[PDB]
């Protein structure tokens with residue numbers, strides 16, 4: 772599966788290099804420019820828990836997901852991962868609980884020590 776490809780071949784994009792966020796680019800985006808901290812960011816995504824028990828998509832809501840990069844408005848893995856993406860790119864992220872919801876989790880939706888996979892498409896990013 773898509774997760775196992777990332778676990779195998781996938782780029783370690785953490786600063787500490789602890790394999791905590793792993794990345795494969797699936798469709799290459801456009802321009803040399805990736806977003807700066809603070810940028811307003813527009814994505815579509817699909818996401819799941821590795822346990823296969825929960826799934827979530829921006830499409831279930833019929834619209835892009837929007838947030839300010841690097842404000843901790845998402846999990847650390849998104850602030851890291853999306854910062855590496857070009858306009859128009861689709862990537863896969865596989866994420867250790869340390870860069871998601873950790874030992875506490877976020878019950879009931881996310882258990883203690885959960886691993887998460889996302890597919891992300893970066894639609895646009897505008898400046899603060």
Ligand SMILES: COc1cc2cc(c1OC)OCCCOC/C=C/C[C@@H](C)OC(=O)[C@@H]1CCCCN1C(=O)[C@H]2C1CCCCC1
Pocket residue numbers: 816818819820825826827836844845846849877880881887
């Ligand atoms: C544990 O809570 C949730 C987790 C996730 C989605 C949740 C959610 O309920 C608040 O609602 C769906 C719409 C997003 O609501 C706005 C804020 C999200 C920010 C924050 C909670 O999440 C994140 O940063 C990440 C990345 C951005 C997309 C959502 N994501 C999630 O962790 C998903 C999660 C993904 C795995 C399957 C279950 C849901």
